[model samples]
Target: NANLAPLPPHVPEHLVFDFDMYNPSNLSAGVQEAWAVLQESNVPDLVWTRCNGGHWIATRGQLIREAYEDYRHFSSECPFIPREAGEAYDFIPTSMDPPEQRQFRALANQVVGMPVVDKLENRIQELACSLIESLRPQGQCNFTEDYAEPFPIRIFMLLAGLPEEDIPHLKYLTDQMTRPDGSMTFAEAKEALYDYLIPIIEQRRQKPGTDAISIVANGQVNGRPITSDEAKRMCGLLLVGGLNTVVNFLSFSMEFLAKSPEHRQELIERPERIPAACEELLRRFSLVADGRILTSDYEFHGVQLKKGDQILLPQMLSGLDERENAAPMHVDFSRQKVSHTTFGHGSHLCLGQHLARREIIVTLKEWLTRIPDFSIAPGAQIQHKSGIVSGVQALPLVWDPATTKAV
Candidate 1:
């Protein structure tokens, strides 16, 4: 089955170009490459593809930036495709526009903002070193599962004061919502996630503590005490950010590093460039795609966008678009102007970006610090999975223990 959905009526015949966001034909080549197909000379800057219930896609960085900036015209009301999924994605701040969206965002920032990241900086560093050191002597690891997943996830759990065991369930629900196999609908997966957070939200309300969860549960929005429902919505957003965003990006970054020894050596020799390396990697390996709905019948760059039409502003695609970067596909740590909106732009910029960067930088600095030389495991084919958050399903990385320098 091609799994093609019918095109919307407002979309003319020429704009109908079928493309599936969740499952793309070029996925094995790599998620970023799969998306790069859109930027090809054959495709239009904007086209209505009848995939995932059909929607518009912005193939250039210029249009993506304009759409994000003009949120008044392009409302984030339904950011996901297949209308139902976006309807189910009712996270505070992101789901609401400015003014109304401002207060709830402030509450969310209180948890994952700069202050909390600074507070946990030392612990983040410790965990990265410990995880890397543990795997250093082994010479091989399923990087996605062994280091990529746990290093950041455990710290996220600690910040939220959750048990390590909750990861599987939480990750599953998040996956269903983001990269659904149709076993569950978006609404169902979101409800399941909400169900998990309900109990803890209740307890934290009674006796608040210093954890991220407690801070959010007890926080206020626009001077009023945050309600449990508000807490659940905001916490759900945090969970998605925690479980999905960084989880996948890490695999993409590590996958590139494993294959490119030259890139590895650059960061190895000049460890201080880890942060700069982090930004370039974020640009090259960027993954995260969501869209905004047209609030009014607006004419954008010659296209007549009708009210309620959904337009995908792919954060991943924007960075990869050659119009936005020179040798866009190449990962250059020293590229003078490494430009990207991977964390998003405009008012709805990602709240947990600082924390995400800290986790990524720490992992890179520590991983290479211990396991200096490594490569993709022998006889294994690396795989990339795409969705709202594209990821490497399995990254079997190997190194010679003898070659690994002792820390």
Candidate 2:
């Protein structure tokens, strides 16, 4: 069985690594602090750590990148948390490999890539500006609930051509996957998503509109029509992809900028720096830490990984590792050649990265222009949660509208 492994003498039995996606504590701090613990102890290679269940934690930058890029050795099928939890994991384009994967990815890119994103640029800008403007007068807003979550969710929904009314329900369902208590299992979350997606998929199939969902529903992969099951799977990925990654990213960046006026001003004063700043932020705060199971026995980084051996690659931890990044903890915009494995490496590089980057760049530019001097609210503690995509739960901000310069 894939689950059985002779206990390696070097790896402690009690040091079980729980690869479970959900974390109920100060998840943001926990993730950063976990890496700090490893770095401070000078643990360079893979370590047995308990996340949801016991698994291997690749803490170093080079190791994580290698684990991700070498897909033949590290498969993406069961790519996150509790090994058993990933049993139901199947996401069409992402779960498939190579030639098959390329077909679905090409079709998906048609909807989410540069052209569609470019068409929606003004819409994204308008949404961001409108969202920020609504809160600017208040001088106090819960950045996460009020702005961060809604801005990206709405943008994604608009792009997908999904109904705004369904956003809240779908968001809740997706949230459960990463924040599941004992009540909801990963299977339950996935099943519920599929159940919900069936209606949407069928509706799109019947009507066959020009929306992204329609493009996907009616589109063919390798000249064969995509099944309803396939459409649900792809839509599920799109929904999850759009909701958490960009939303959490925006929240983290906003929280960082809110606290560091100098950084905010740096971007504000030099509008050209926004793109680089976004990349740096993505590198510094890469929030995704996911893993894949080994389908076949393999040796990597001086460690022998047998079939079904689970491997974890924390997205942010790699860039934060001082070995790979200079002053890894600090966010430095001027760092020349700031390369990172935040978006994963090799073949599995994030397909939706272009859209995410645009959303980030535009939001930063617009928000800084509108609310330049925002800061964390007094006596309010901003907390972060962890999962496939980790980010702040709520970021409370306070700013003075009077600080606005005459535009």
Candidate 3:
């Protein structure tokens, strides 16, 4: 008797999508593989039944862009996870909407944007060369462990003026936030971050220096002095943003170059192409998912979204989705217009993008000049995982330095 029920006549069958954010299975392939399933199915739109709770999944490029651009109907505050979990989203600049979000973003940008990055360019280039040089003679190395994670992480730490010794602890805490096990929930991870940041915030507040943290801690937001709590939150966001996203990007780009000799040769032969290649690679391999919630009932592309509804826009999907791209899966440097939602769109775009771009471009130029030919270790499987910031767990690459002339 309980099973017998009539469905509502107005509900469309095509909109039913199933995506479980908390399911251990969902976490296994990461979000990219799950998105592949949807891509293969060719389902334009589907309702995903999330493990924590079900939500709508939009697969096409246009819908995803519209969802992100329209802040009036779609809010960014609760972009991912279930209502209960997403409600706890409180990263100062990221979680805040327009007017409030603008101030913190400008302050954070002063340290991460173009001018500071240009000043750090030589140091960045030197570091990348040094890292590649150390591994060239070895002929074989775990790319992720040896170079990818450490390089960008260390750079961020130095830029932020945090001690190098604290890198491992902070990195571990961030990992817990993205890949939570039974021992820690997202909320718990946030608390741990707060506990770690409080003392640093206090120290910086008392004696503000020239470091990135000091720039933010003593900076003003929207014509008013930023509060201690605000500083902690902003610092935490910058730390996680720099560490996870850029590290993953480094691994992915390096892994691609290792596998493709032709691409490596192209970049090595023409160094100027490295910048364009970086942009293309970012567009082709974007792998983050950021979302927003509906603040009020709204109609989008003929579908109605009620207030409190959550929407997801996978960062990789917009540019990489095959429908909008000529060959979305392939990495091509010569693409005409390398526009992508990788960094994001509109006012909420990534503030640290300039720094990230410089790191990737500089690493490619330096690495190609040193070791132009490298491949994955024979018979060793390279695995990639997904989360808020997705990347390979290991990239075991091998190359013979003797093939190239000594620099």
- Candidates in order have lDDT scores of 0.88, 0.78, 0.76
Flag regions of model 3 displaced more than 4 Å: 1-13, 20-34, 404-406
lDDT of 1 by residue, 121-147 (tens): 999999998888888899999988898
Output the number of the TM-score-best candidate.
Answer: 1
TM-score per candidate: 0.98, 0.92, 0.92
Show model 1 residue runs off by greater than 4 Å.
none
| Model 3 TM-score relative to the real fold | 0.92
Q: Which run of 10 residues does model 2 get worst, by summed lDDT?
A: 17-26
Q: Mark the 10 consecutive residues where model 1 has the least summed lDDT.
A: 1-10
Of 2 and 3, the candidate ranking higher by TM-score: 2
Q: Which of candidates 1 and 2 is the stronger one according to lDDT?
A: 1
How many residue pairs collide in each prediction? 0, 16, 14
